[PDB]
């Protein structure tokens, strides 16, 4: 299940996050869908994605204040870009420091953008809380 | 910056490692190069590599009791195998659980077969470890 | 649109494909679905797959004298090998030599095996076409 | 050998292009590389690259009036971005219509850019002339 790496995230009836003390937003994309491993998380495939210097955060379009959710960027490992080349839409694969199999880890799929520059903002986010 | 994931392996003189208490050989492959990340590790470009229930060890062909390394299967998570349409040789990449950087992860490259069947033991020999 | 590259293929109830002329059986894998391009072609779903010295020759499982396909060998120009890491199941790519859009490729999809000896066969076999 | 698939192309001593009637440039990128199947192209390896309504264009940094190639988006079937996860640059591999073997296609490589939108701008001019 999903909701072992992901948490519960707060917003304002508009869909704006709540964020933590010292929390900062970085970048934002539109229309992105959840995977957990090769699956679609249901339900959660159109809504906008932030990326904050702690975080990654799935806001829901249709029910933001029931269906938005969390990531700690401090259990990830690795997050790695696909082009899109048998995928319908680009993909972020965000790989976990301690799986509980190798079957779980995330995808963010881009469904309005290519996703290049979330992408690129991740991994600089990632490494600042890997080198320290 | 390897050796902060690899760690010396002792063996004999004709290539054959010690291994550890109840610690069992799996699979071997032979002509096998290792990269740290997008490099080559530059004396451990021709060994055969070798599957154990706990490990995977590289064993040098040119100098085993001196450039042979061993990792261990219980600081991975992920596995992913490329079948070499851009790179000379297929690889197997291998993903730590808590790299120094996202820049820090471990290839094989697998020379003189397809290295389908050591992936594919690898695969399990980690999947075993993880659950 | 994938009919602008497969061809019809006559069977035998059981399954049989009807070969040419000097046509000969090369290798069979089972369980493969068909795309065009990204998406699926909808009730090919379910086959074996043949590699013949001139032929990829897709023959379904469901309705065999109905829904079989062949695709020319001298239609195609590479072939990529995908493991499946975000697929289902692992993916042989062919790409052909005179596309009408660059949307249009196609894969093989190896739903109970790796794919890989059907792969390896089938580069040997365009090369031997190309060269 | 390369030169089946590329042609010389003639540039100013400044390094500009001589292009044929009526053919217009459309996207410029610096410090590429060059690729035939695997292997580096020796001495094309710095280049700014140029995409035109009918060519792909490469001009050398050290020699433009010598070492300058061209290849036809005619002979072109597909083109394919790869992100950069086993190689040191993003590659853009273009595929031929007509291969004389399948380890015969080309490479650009990347090495002051991420070639996203080079990329996609070959993908379009590429489309245009296979629709036709």
Known sequence: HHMEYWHYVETTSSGQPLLREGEK???????????????????????????TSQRIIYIDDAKPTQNSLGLELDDLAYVNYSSG????????????????????????????????????????????????
């Open 85 to 132: 080349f048998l995928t319908r839409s680009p993909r972020l694969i965000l790989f976990f420091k301690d799986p509980s199999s190798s079957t779980e880890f995330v995808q963010l799929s881009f469904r309005k953008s290519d996703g290049v520059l979330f992408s690129q903002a991740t991994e600089r986010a990632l490494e600042n809380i890997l080198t320290e």
């Open 25 to 51: 937003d970085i970048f934002i994309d539109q229309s992105v869908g959840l995977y957990h491993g090769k699956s679609k998380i249901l339900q959660r495939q159109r809504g906008r994605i932030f990326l």
